[PDB]
Amino acid sequence: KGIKNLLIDLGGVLINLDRERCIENFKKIGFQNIEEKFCTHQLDGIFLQQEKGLITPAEFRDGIREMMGKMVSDKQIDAAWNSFLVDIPTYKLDLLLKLREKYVVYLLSNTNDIHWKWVCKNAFPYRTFKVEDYFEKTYLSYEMKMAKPEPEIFKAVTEDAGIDPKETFFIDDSEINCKVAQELGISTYTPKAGEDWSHLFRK
Ligand SMILES: [Cl-]
Ligand code: NA
Ligand code: NA
């Protein structure tokens, strides 16, 4: 009945995102028809694969270069890709640190190696803290080879962490991710974009 564990999403829930900026940054390095490729769906394949760790970062970049027909550098590709990521506001880092007093806090994120490296270097470090300080464990799609909202990802987390779904609260801005978690017995909250969800924890 009582909540012991939190499962927190990264994208949106912690880190602000900017798809427009990322798309435009790709166009600037030469991916002229990236919006045109998005419809083609040639893209969705490479992004979905990266998200499940099914291709390496080297493959991802090669795949981008191949779709661009241009020999842009890894540094360029990473910069354009990482520009999807904006910031984790520090009040959310304070909140995570505080929540640890009462809850075992886990991260459960669909993400990829390039983005994860970026947030660990540029968003999580704060005061004397690093990413290891906020979470008991970080569950990442690309490491797990599964992605939300597949039921198996949630079951894998609860099995690995050794937790009761019924004692678990999941915060994720995707409605379908939450509905799947609910079917497993996990309680959920679906914040809106830019929502400060600290209100959930007011005494
Ligand atoms: Cl995420
Ligand atoms: Na999200
Ligand atoms: Na930790």
Query: How many angstroms is it from 105 CA to the middle of ligand 1?
Result: 15
> Which secondary-structure segment (H or E) carries 66?
helix 57-68
3-class secondary structure, 201? helix
What backbone phi and psi angles, to 5 degrees, belong to 143?
-80, -30
3-class secondary structure, 140? strand
Do residues 142 and 51 touch, judged by C-beta distance below 8 A?
A: yes
Ligand nearest to the CA of 96: 3
Marked catalytic residue, from 9, 78, 164, 196: 9
Say if residue 9 carries a ligand binding annotation. Answer: yes
- Cα 138 to Cα 133: distance, rounded to the nearest angstrom: 11
Do residues 167 and 3 touch, judged by C-beta distance below 8 A?
A: yes
CATH 3.40.640.10 fits 1-14+89-203, yes or no: no
Note every long-range contact of 75-83, with CB atoms under 8 Å and residues 24 or more positions apart, other chains counting: 76/29, 77/29, 78/114, 78/118, 79/25, 80/22, 80/25, 80/26, 80/28, 80/29, 80/31, 81/22, 81/26, 81/114, 81/115, 82/114, 82/115, 82/118, 83/18, 83/21, 83/22, 83/25
> Which secondary-structure segment (H or E) carries 5?
strand 5-8
List, by residue range, all CATH 1.10.150.240 domains of the chain.
Answer: 15-88
3-class secondary structure, 134? coil
Say if residue 74 carries a ligand binding annotation. Answer: no
Positions of E strands within 9-163? 104-109, 137-140
Ligand nearest to the CA of 106: 3
Say if residue 53 carries a ligand binding annotation. Answer: no
Overall fold of domain 15-88: DNA polymerase; domain 1 (1.10.150)
Query: How many angstroms is it from 101 CA to the middle of ligand 3?
Result: 13
User: Is there a catalytic annotation at residue 160?
Assistant: no
Say if residue 87 carries a ligand binding annotation. Answer: no
Ligand nearest to the CA of 104: 3
Amino acid 105 reads V
Query: How many angstroms is it from 131 CA to the middle of ligand 3?
Result: 7
- The residue length of the chain stands at 203
List, by residue range, all CATH 3.40.50.1000 domains of the chain.
Answer: 1-14+89-203
Query: How many angstroms is it from 148 CA to the middle of ligand 1?
Result: 9
With CA atoms as reference, report the closest residue to 163 among 55, 20, 3.
3
